[PDB]
Design goal:
binds calcium ion, binds zinc ion, globular, Collagenase (Catalytic Domain), binds a molecule of 2 linked components (R47-6PJ), alpha/beta, 23% helix, monomer, five-stranded mixed sheet, 17% strand
Length: 159
């Protein structure tokens, strides 16, 4: 196994909000993202408004404090760090993208599910149906199901 959280109670905090979407939409998209993984694991995710949280959600552009700079609109949409203290577990989203709640631009919910998967310690899949497939794909939020590979992967880490 790579790094895994050694606790089932995992907190998260949204450090800043993208101006592309309204604030509640970002809150909703992120909350549903964690719930996707919560549905198939013994993991419980709780939101923190102020203070220390395991998983920090950040919207930034270009070079932004870590050794992994973003590249403007297109290309890399986001990245996340594996489980661990400090920057570990944190998920950063490229602000040069246009985040949406739909098919247009880049869907935040889908990207968040993928990144949180990284935050939980998952690698990539070669299954085009898997959410941990390396490249983005849009699918209606309610024709959406976790692939068997995603579920097998995450259950091998927790439970
Ligand atoms: C309407 C519709 N429809 C339909 C539908 C259906 C649906 C569904 C189904 C299903 N499912 C679900 C899921 C899956 C599905 C599928 O498959 N789908 C497919 C689709 C396809 O489409 C096509 C098109 O495409 C497009 C795409 O585009 C996009 C692009 C982009 N990309 C890129 O490239 C980017 C950029 C962009 C710009 O430029 O801007 N980039 C990227 O991405 C990067 C890369 C770069 C490089 O590398 O260089 N990357 C990044 O960014 C990263 C981050 C991220 C990621 C992400 C993501 C990922 C992934 C994803 C996904 C995928 C897939 C899926 C999903 Cl859900 C998700 C997402 C996202 N984000 O972000 C970076 P990173 O990684 O972080 C990194 C960083 C740094 C470093 Br140093 C490292 C790293 C399903 C499922 C499942 C299943 C199964 S299982 O077992 O598996 O569970 C099974 C089955 S079976 O059958 O076999 O049993 C199944 C399944 C499933 C199904 C299939 C069911 C239909 C219904 C079909 C229809 C429709 C419509 C219509 C119709 C008709 S009509 O006539 O009307 O027309 C008809 C019909 S019939 O048939 O009835 O006839 C139908 C229909
Ligand atoms: Ca980019
Ligand atoms: Ca962290
Ligand atoms: Ca933006
Ligand atoms: Zn970053
Ligand atoms: Zn990935």
């Amino acid at each position: 196994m790579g790094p895994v959280w050694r606790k089932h109670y995992i907190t998260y905090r949204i450090n800043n909000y993208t101006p592309d979407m309204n604030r509640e939409d970002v809150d909703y998209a992120i909350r549903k993202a964690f719930q996707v993984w919560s549905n198939v694991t013994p993991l419980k995710f709780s939101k923190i408004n102020t203070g220390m949280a395991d998983i920090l959600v950040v919207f930034a552009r270009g070079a932004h404090g870590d050794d992994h700079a973003f590249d403007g609109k297109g290309g890399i949409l986001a990245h996340a760090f594996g489980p661990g203290s400090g920057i570990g577990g944190d998920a950063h989203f490229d602000e040069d993208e246009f985040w949406t709640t739909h098919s247009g631009g880049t869907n935040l919910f889908l990207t968040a599910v993928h990144e949180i998967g990284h935050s939980l310690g998952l690698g990539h899949s070669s299954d085009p149906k898997a959410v941990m497939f390396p490249t983005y794909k849009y699918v209606d939020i309610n024709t959406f199901r976790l692939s068997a590979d995603d579920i097998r992967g995450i259950q091998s880490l927790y439970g």
